[PDB]
Design a protein around this ligand. Structure first.
Ligand SMILES: N=CCc1c[nH]c2ccccc12
Ligand SMILES: N=CCc1c[nH]c2ccccc12
Lengths: 359, 121, 359, 109
């Protein structure tokens, strides 16, 4: 009379979809990606990601990539670090790509698991605990390169204006730019001038990323810029997020994936909190500040609802916000963000949400 | 009657443990997990076996045989957990028993979610 | 000048230890045994048990046995059903014993994973979904016998008065007894006469177990008995747990590991709730009833604290109860149990607690 | 007090306090393995007004303890100052990298 079937695809169109990376820290070997419809908050499915999984969507929007660690017997036996390719509509596993056993195990910053702008290479952070950047060639389904030049550096910022270039933040306060050949090996590299003082004004690793420049906020609320319109990165800063009346309450940035850039408008979003002092750099947002990057001035401020991480959709003018368990959907088509809805229970321990690529 | 097609019902009513046909459900309702009452969420697989029982339909006044299949091979959905026990019996009446994993014979036995399949009068 | 070290043993003596089997149903691939000190509520350690682990302690108190399921990639790859032997004191893995891929995956009733009285064999329930009982030779570390004679039966009730004998409950309402030879193969077996009506008065599988007999409670508050003091099993029942006032309020049993027997006194402990009807047989305890099994009268009734499972220690006259998350310690040296303490947050989703053996 | 996140030694703990997990500040719970590597923090002792070097070794090879979760960030810095960073698993190089709990080992002033 009725029969149960599998083989089905996600009910909602890809343009409705977001990916909540649930670390499940209390049970970190059962991390997973929760797929939601941002328009109505409906749960659409999930991808299992074992121990401390990381996730991104292929730039063409056809696949989900995960990165994770298995062991033969979980808590004992042989380690396998892998990237997995999953079909975006079927949410089925397709392909496993072997990594050396040193992929980063850590909280879900965007910059630990990325891709080249052309979509041809997965670009990931290694730590053994020596750091290097790993390159995976998607068409080949193989690990093709270990960027040991990136030693003493951390995290991956892709250049949206180049097919296969990305930068990383280095312990000298500068950026290292890697340009890959078509085979995913380093073709060229360049190192910037010191952008920030590591000791005096450390930056959060999360970039507010433009087509041809990246903005970075600091522990004390300063702003640094890296311009890569040219082959050599030009660095500037700092300028202050704080006007004179902000300074009394010691407003500083806090969070994880804490900034975002709306490319068309030049608006940068930052999670902020008052009473900043040593050790408050991961505090939940009391407020979201919206800054014009051109004029270097705040244009809006709203309540932060304890958010820690965000992401921006350029095409639909949306910001997602995430306090660890709940996702807020904001309309950012105007300088002041409007709250559209809150998805409650989207995760138990998530520090990362992402849109399905559209356009 | 409309009572017999969960696809036609209000979601909030179908996604409740009190929904007339969910009367011996142990686990997460698939209809809250990306699927429907009769479809596995994407990337999860129907169990060829299940526990079974009968449920009373308060709407048309009749009793129905339900087959409680699981969907398998992904980690726990975690949403809409039910533990109803109408006419459930211990493992010496094994196919009336819901304290076992009905994914046990699937290619991957990891339990994802469970549902309520209408067999008939 | 401090130095971090491992290789340490459980800090409290064995006789203080309890084992809370946490299924972690919300993240069932990361079930685990929580080891507690029942005297002061201190967490002493843990053993990881992957998907839906089951656990028991060796009769001699030296080892912990677990039974679990692995797959090469957790949600895909080849299945490995195993028993594992762990040191009880160091809480370290020692040995894996391969099982056929049909070990019971289900809630942690005592009778799914047991051992012979001599402690030489592990006796476990299989479901494929056809049922059989598996025998593991502990010393040889091998699965040695498949008891398909037990098809259509369920769970293992070891006979404490014989070295290698156990019973199981069958779909005919009687018991099947299996006696093992020194090699773990079935030497003999016998079937009792019908103890209960399967359709009209089904019993809970959990025995209130004496040295030479076992009592069972029914969905409708009757008591049944299997006496194995002699050559063949003698069965009796029903007698009601309920007086007239009880019946009018529709009191019935509810729970999982819901019964216990204090052997010295003949007292039986049963979780009960009022307003019983079809479908309430797993309801949280409104009360614990204490039955004298010789006189067949209730000697005490106390608050259930929503308990679902329990266990008894003979020498110290203790009962533990467990509501899924919290463990309650009761002194039962007198007919009326005294509440000694509650251990809060002992598990997220546990239906089984066990004392370390002291004999 | 050592079981509190506020305890002065715990000023850069991200994880579960091993003292709540069947171990102590300086001993891994039974059947879990010390990490040979670790993030380092600098913590103020309110009892003598001095600052100390604290080493935050993880205990590894068992699943998450889940007890006494701390997320304190005194003098913690991002991955470009890697050995001051606590958003990474300091079990990363262990025979088994599964994270169980975190210790707070006093090194020196
Ligand atoms: N002391 C660091 C624990 C930790 C912090 N972030 C993590 C991510 C994965 C695994 C472990 C961790
Ligand atoms: N419908 C069956 C789900 C279930 C009920 N009890 C279980 C134990 C382990 C795994 C799954 C289950």
């Amino acid at each position: 009379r009725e029969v149960l079937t599998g083989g089905h695809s996600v009910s909602a169109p890809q343009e409705n979809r977001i990916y909540v990376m649930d670390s499940v820290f209390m049970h970190l070997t059962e991390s997973r990606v929760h797929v939601y419809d941002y328009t109505n908050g409906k749960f659409l499915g999930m991808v299992p990601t074992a121990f401390n999984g990381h996730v991104q969507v292929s730039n063409d929007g056809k696949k989900i990539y995960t990165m994770t660690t298995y062991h033969e017997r979980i808590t004992r036996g042989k380690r396998s670090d892998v990237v997995e390719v999953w079909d975006a509509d079927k949410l089925t596993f397709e392909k496993e790509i072997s990594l050396p056993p040193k992929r980063v195990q850590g909280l879900n910053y965007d910059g630990l698991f990325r891709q080249t702008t052309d979509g041809k290479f997965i670009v990931l952070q290694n730590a053994s605990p020596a750091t290097s950047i790993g390159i995976v060639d998607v068409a080949k389904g193989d690990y093709v390169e270990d960027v040991t030049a990136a030693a003493g550096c951390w995290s991956v910022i892709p250049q949206p204006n180049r097919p296969r270039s990305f930068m990383t933040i280095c312990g000298d306060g500068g950026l290292l730019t890697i340009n890959l050949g078509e085979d995913g090996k380093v073709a060229s590299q360049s190192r910037s001038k010191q952008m920030f003082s590591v000791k005096d004004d450390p930056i959060f690793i999360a970039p507010a990323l433009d087509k041809d420049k990246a903005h970075f906020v600091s522990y004390y609320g300063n702003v640094y810029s890296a311009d890569f319109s040219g082959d050599e990165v030009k660095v500037d800063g700092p300028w202050s997020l704080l006007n004179d009346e902000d300074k009394a309450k010691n407003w500083v940035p806090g969070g994880y994936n804490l900034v975002g850039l709306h490319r068309a408008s030049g608006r940068m979003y930052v999670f902020m909190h008052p009473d900043g002092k040593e050790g408050t750099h991961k505090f939940p947002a009391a407020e979201i500040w919206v800054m014009d990057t051109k004029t270097k001035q705040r244009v809006a401020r709203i309540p932060g609802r304890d958010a820690l991480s965000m992401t921006i959709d350029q095409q639909r003018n949306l910001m997602l916000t995430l306090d660890g368990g709940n996702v807020n959907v904001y309309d950012i088509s105007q300088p002041e963000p409007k709250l559209l809805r809150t998805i409650e229970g989207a995760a138990e321990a998530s520090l990362q949400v992402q849109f399905h690529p559209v356009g | 009657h409309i009572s017999l097609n969960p696809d036609l019902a209000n979601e909030d009513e179908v996604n409740s443990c009190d929904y007339w046909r969910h009367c011996a459900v142990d686990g997460f309702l698939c209809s809250c997990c990306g699927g429907t009452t009769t479809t596995c969420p994407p990337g999860s697989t129907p169990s060829p076996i299940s526990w079974i029982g009968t449920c009373h339909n308060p709407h048309d006044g009749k009793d129905y045989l339900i087959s409680y299949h699981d969907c398998c091979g992904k980690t726990a959905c975690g949403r809409c957990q039910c533990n109803t026990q109408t006419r459930e019996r211990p493992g010496y009446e094994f196919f009336l028993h819901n304290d076992v994993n009905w994914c046990m014979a699937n290619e991957n036995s990891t339990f994802h979610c469970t549902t309520s399949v209408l067999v008939g009068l």
